[PDB]
Amino acid sequence: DYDIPTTENLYFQGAMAFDGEDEVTGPDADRARAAAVQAVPGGTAGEVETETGEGAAAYGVLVTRPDGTRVEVHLDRDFRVLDTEPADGDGG
Numbered sequence: 001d002y003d004i005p006t007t008e009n010l011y012f013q014g015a016m017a018f019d020g021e022d023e024v025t026g027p028d029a030d031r032a033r034a035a036a037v038q039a040v041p042g043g044t045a046g047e048v049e050t051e052t053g054e055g056a057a058a059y060g061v062l063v064t065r066p067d068g069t070r071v072e073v074h075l076d077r078d079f080r081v082l083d084t085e086p087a088d089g090d091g092g
Contacts, residue, residue: 020040029091045064055081060075
C-alpha cells in the first residue's frame with residue numbers, strides 16, 4: 001500500500017493486507033517475525049515491510065503460512081521493483 005498503486009501485482013496482495021498486514025522493518029528477519037504471527041492474526045501470515053533503497057519506495061509485502069514461509073514482494077517506484085520473492089524465513 002505504501003508503494004505505488006500502479007505497480008504489477010503489488011496491488012493485488014494489498015487486498016488481503018487489510019486483514020492484519022502491519023508494518024515490518026525491511027529485511028526478512030523482521031518480516032519473518034512479524035508476518036509469522038503478527039500478520040497471521042488477520043487471516044494469513046503476511047505483513048508489509050518498508051525499506052529505502054536507491055529508488056523511491058523500497059518496501060515489500062510478504063504473505064504465506066505462519067510456519068516460517070512467507071511471500072515477500074518487491075515494490076519500488078523505481079519502475080523495476082514489481083516482482084516477488086519467496087521468503088524462506090532465512091532470506092538467503
